[PDB]
Symmetry: C3
Subunit: 598 residues, 3 copies
């Protein structure tokens, strides 16, 4: 039987005709043509004689997957399915352009991977570096071509085999898309590793329209050797992370792991849930990464995320090289609900909703960060966590605006004394920020706003309490070493009646010509003896800066009343006109709202 021989051969399907639903108007095809409309790893997972090899822990699937990608790339692209119901193990490094990236598989343009099954790293990779999927085509990324139109999706899994790092200097990654344009990962679970990143998008600003959506990242740090981790690093513009889940269980992750980093303009991190990490997101312009999309990171969005972290939620920064200065501006952080998970004070990096972070060498004077809006977020830290702040302002800041947040933590504004001395401009804390009471009674010796800066200019701090905290030393304190000019500092009187210090200016900075301030204080006054309208004067001469003051106290007396309002005198006394129904020197201790130019 000649026909038998043909039909049973690999050419057989090319001899069996087919026409869609027996439609006389349809194309006369061969079965092979229709089968050729799809492709899977099974079509390349064979020995040199063409016999299928079953996958398993004792088989290295790398060369077969690479053969599939290379072939489909040759025919103008398509989608290769990694079949469900099997685990496909990888057990060797790739060659050529990806060798410079410890690469296993080389991605190619217009070739998508539909991962429905599981991909698992074999013990070959224990204690070694690896980047599982690499879209660079040269070991030097500067000399690499682009990866375009490459999408990885499905219900499958990338499993890093649990192996610890061999050395802190090693790098490990899941997907490095490279100089990547229109690439994405959707639906995939990345799990069980000790890695630097799960996914990186772009290279130093080269790339566009790269997205990570509906992915899970689970337990991707597990050792003390791991130097640092960010799950997704976004290093091209017009790119981002949406609707993902990030979880860690290791103690190490609570000290080293961040969920996302946004490093180029028009990038976003939205609608995701994070548990067990140190940090939520870095939002930065590194001068060293400015080649592809310029030296400005603008239009940066962190919105509608949910997080339990141990360190800082959003870290802002920018820095310089010999030839480039990085700028960060036009940032929005909104709709996020974030807490510091239960932990001892000082047992992880300092807790913060916003951190203004010094550069990688510790420099606090290279930053150009401005036009940042932080609005409609909620932040909570347990009462014991001394090291918790709405903002840790540790490096130069050229602007940040807080409106309509709920912050419930130890400090509102903080920087550690005897560390950096930031120059602060255009810091706005609107009165609409609600200050919670979880840390009430825990603030002995502490200043709610602790202004440990070199200087503050064109700034607004409108303090509004919503309950007592009579433990705090002050609502806001400026050390004598902090210059203050062209600024507005106010403390609302509600819940403050029993505080000896509301606002403290240790260098008398509130006396500046262009400082606008109001806060409560207790003042002792004595009157003249005159019957009728009579002056009251303050005993102390500490009020040369006061433009007006008014009573926050009732008058318990019948035969006289102190002034409702006061001005000052050249010698620093307050003075006002009260009323003596009967004559007599009067003496009273009253709570006043002290006002300067407001």
């Amino acid at each position: 039987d000649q026909f038998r021989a043909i039909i049973e051969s690999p050419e057989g399907a090319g001899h069996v005709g087919y026409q869609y639903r027996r439609n006389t108007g349809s194309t006369m095809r061969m079965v092979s043509d229709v089968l050729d409309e799809r492709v899977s790893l099974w079509d390349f997972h064979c020995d040199p004689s063409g016999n299928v090899i079953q996958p398993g822990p004792n088989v290295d699937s790398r060369q077969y997957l690479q053969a599939a990608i290379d072939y489909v790339s040759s025919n103008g692209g398509g989608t290769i399915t990694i079949p469900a119901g099997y685990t496909w193990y990888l057990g060797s490094y790739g060659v050529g352009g990806i060798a410079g990236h410890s690469g296993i598989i080389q991605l190619r343009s217009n070739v998508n991977l539909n991962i429905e099954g599981r991909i698992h790293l074999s013990p070959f990779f224990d204690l070694k570096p690896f980047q599982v999927f690499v879209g660079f085509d040269n070991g030097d990324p500067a000399s690499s071509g682009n990866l375009e139109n490459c999408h990885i999706y499905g219900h499958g899994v990338v499993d890093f085999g649990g192996y610890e790092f061999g050395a802190s200097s090693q790098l490990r990654n899941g997907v490095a898309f490279g100089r990547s344009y229109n690439c994405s990962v959707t639906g995939i679970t990345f799990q069980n590793g000790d890695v630097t990143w799960a996914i990186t998008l772009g290279w130093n600003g080269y790339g566009s329209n790269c997205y990570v959506r509906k992915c899970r990242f689970i337990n991707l740090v597990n050792s003390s050797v791991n130097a640092d981790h960010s799950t997704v690093y976004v290093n091209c513009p017009y790119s981002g992370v949406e609707s993902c889940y990030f979880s860690m269980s290791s103690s190490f992750a609570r000290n080293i792991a961040c969920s996302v980093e946004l490093h180029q303009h028009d990038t976003f991190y939205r609608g995701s849930t994070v548990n067990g990490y140190c940090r939520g997101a870095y939002v930065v312009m590194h001068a060293a990464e400015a080649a592809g999309a310029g030296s400005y990171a603008y239009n940066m969005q962190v919105e509608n995320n949910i997080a339990v972290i141990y360190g800082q939620f959003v870290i802002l920064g920018s820095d310089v090289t010999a030839t480039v200065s990085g700028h960060l501006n036009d940032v929005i952080v909104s709709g996020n609900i974030v807490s510091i998970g239960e932990r001892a004070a000082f047992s992880a990096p300092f807790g913060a909703f916003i951190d203004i972070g010094p550069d990688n060498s510790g420099a606090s004077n290279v930053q150009d960060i401005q036009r940042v809006l932080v609005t409609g977020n909620s932040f909570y830290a347990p009462a014991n966590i001394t090291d918790s702040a709405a903002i840790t302002l540790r490096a130069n800041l050229n602007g940040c605006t807080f409106i309509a947040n709920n912050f419930d933590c130890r400090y509102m504004v903080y920087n550690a004394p005897g560390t950096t001395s930031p120059v602060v401009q255009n810091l706005v804390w609107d009165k609409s920020n609600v200050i919670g009471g979880t840390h009430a009674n825990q603030r002995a010796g502490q200043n709610l706003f602790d202004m440990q800066f070199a200087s503050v200019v064109n700034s607004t701090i409108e303090v509004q309490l919503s309950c007592e905290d009579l433990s705090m030393f002050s609502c806001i304190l400026f050390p004598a070493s902090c210059q203050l000019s062209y600024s507005k500092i106010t403390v609302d009187s509600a819940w403050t009646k029993s505080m000896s210090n509301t606002a403290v200016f240790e260098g008398n900075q509130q006396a500046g010509a262009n400082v606008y301030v109001s806060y409560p204080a207790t003042v002792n006054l004595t009157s003249y003896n005159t019957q009728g309208a009579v002056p009251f004067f303050s005993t102390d001469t500490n009020y040369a800066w006061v433009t007006s003051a008014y009573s926050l106290s009732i008058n318990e007396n019948l035969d006289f009343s102190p002034p409702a309002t006061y001005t000052n005198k050249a010698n620093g006394q307050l003075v006002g006109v009260g009323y003596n129904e009967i004559g007599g020197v009067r003496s009273v201790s009253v709570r006043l709202m002290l006002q300067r130019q407001v």
Copy 2:
């Protein structure tokens, strides 16, 4: 012809060789192997002799779909397509573990359903309970195994056949995922029923990473027999509902139907549109559901939804059992635009943006709700709807914060007199909340903020009007039965000049040592006869609590001026110093801002 017999047999495709695109480097396969890469209901929808059965209203497809799921489960999973262009009817109950859940189909781990066609319930199910897809494997959920990695997706439809409930005690569901980990429904339309739920995720905190996305839910309540309905019930952590559409047309739905419920930590409801429902979302910690994820519901997010409802948008609650106390905290409700649809006053449950709801037995003293942020929402109710409030505060509340919302309805804060007497702590209504004017002139006999509580502590109400409503009895009223301490209550003067009552304290609660208050009032004053600086005193003695007051009125006179500011006296009179250019007793009725400790 022996070969003929083989080829035409069910083994035939196993004798036809194939090699992808005639690539010599590809696997030598058989056609059957490639066809085996997919699977559909057609592969199991056959009689006991293997002959295909066409689906239709007179065929029960249940056993065939179950056979497909069971088989694919056996081979490590995959995705079964329910083909487009056909309606597949279900006409009997399933057996075994799902019998305890009125189950039709049993879902199995790692077996996905790609529903491209229609699934329709046959009249067998009329007046009966049913749960169409069940992931429990035991009638007792406590004894059930887990369902993992089960995804239902496609462009198809689940049609509940229109059948009314037979009895109010019956339950009906579309998908019960069970103790569910990494399960999801995407793209599916659920329609034409009278059901309890369309989808439930998790069981009493057991489960994770379950999501409902891009689904439609249309007309799923149609009878008076239906006891209660919530379209999606989220009962496992790290789970949620995103970008869905919910519509009802029945009158019954306007009284009984809610779109989503969030019952465990780290859950979300975002970006969805609701029409025709009673309620938007319950956000609750039931102690009885605390087994799998603990007794705290935290990190609860309701954001960027669009709704026309007839009752309450978000209902908050928590409750207790003999052995567990439920807590609800760290909630954010933001970016939502919501209205009460046109209806008569009191014709549906009381309209509210936020409701603090008593437990299922009516208890108002079992709740532990705090750290809730409601910000950047818009709420509207038509002018006739008396029963509309920004918040109906009906049970104990340990904290809720309102910032930067626009509320345009009858009441801002309300609880019905002669009902519950909530203990309220840490209620914050920031001045940035804009109060609309749709209900201006409709508020005769009514208090905008009607503080019908047992007690209020550590609370802030900053009332700002944006137009007149001279019909209202008061801006805020505290009955004598409401204790008030350590709180800030302010009424801005804008649009209030003609109001006889701005703030009303029926038990003189504003006199408390730690109550901080300011509001306008009209006061009559008379002066002494003295030429020059002269005292003015109030006729009435109702101001022992006032620390300062200032004029909100012009002075129409030429020969004297009343005081700009006043303090008080021990007998409760106000006193201030004005000026008599000419001597004479003066008498004036002036509008004052009365201030206490602010």
Copy 3:
């Protein structure tokens, strides 16, 4: 060989049996039956003898794609794949119902297109109108049937061939879904054209549940002939655009192109990124489009978008026909970060975050726009861009509310003098709006809030600066031609000490009985000679409207103090009581906060 002849025929696959994975419990099928579970363009892309035709620039694929759609429609629907690895060119118009829409392909209900390859317009379409995919079935949309359940998705591309418009009156579109119910486009890149729209949803309110998700729109305007462009036009309710990318590079786009328009109730535009466009979104109710969903556009959401534009971000409007009045209400604009891209002043349409736009004939008195909430957005325009405003209020407005935004541009509120004279009601600018300083020192001769209106009622403007701008003429100015009543206008004193004009009322409008105002001013005062309590009077008589004033200045003198507070007198002088320790006439120039009814 008879069998040979059969097997090699188009009936051959119908003679090769198959049974899934050799399962004895599975259906005995033929290979043809399984192949029939999918369908692609290859099944119809053949000559009249059934021989396949390869696609290419010299082949018109139109009739073959139409044949596929028509056939699948006949069998109750399904999904047709447009295969990857090929470009499929379109080179002629379609016939019948779509001819009235310059249609190429007619979409049919329940027939989806999985576009994995590229679709490209041939030069036939140069200088001509075209709508590539049309879901109308009649040239007159009023007589058209509905398109239902039609989804276009995949990783492919629709390429418009780069051809310029032939005439401004022509229309070009990518997908017109028609009277469209449950239709969507997901994942597709639309590029390289000169078109009116890429996608339109619905027709004059007819349609529902239509969505555009994860699409890219790149370079879709390229000529001066193009009259106007909006990328996605949403003209049915319960529909919207989510997570899309929009980019233009042409100069023309910066003057004519808008990314999205929302024209019916319950529509949304979220989570998208825009670069190179004139405008972000129109949100409008055109009376002429009111047939299918009524004359109210309500529940309109513009959230969490990222944009660099050259004109206006959100344009609001409504208008009338002979028989219908359009209303726009219940709008939310939040979470957006938007800037005007670098450009010269007046080189593109006037820059604005919100524009209240006159109708297409220029009418400013047909609008009914109200209950709009603009909250938690950030807007920036470079310092040189004179024509930049938070809101350009150019037509009648019945309400708009601004809370907790950061606006950094030339004007906050603006309308050009000598143009329209809007009637403004219920405009609310909350104090929580942060006014940036990029345009500080650029505002010579300009008013920050320039109230160029016919009238303002029931409005709130609470101006809060966050730095000096001593160049501006005033913070807020009302021309004499603007009536002002029942409104609250306040200027906070911070950073204003050196301004000669803070608030300017050119028709003395602040004197109205129901106008509530406070702002700083410098006043000269002189006292009587009396030792002791002594009156000070203003030199000028411009203060008949002032209810109280207080000092914003220190007192540099030792022997006297001026009053802390003042009232007025019938002749318009201010008067207050100070203190002369020694007798003598005193004369001082002081900075006062002037207050009226607040």
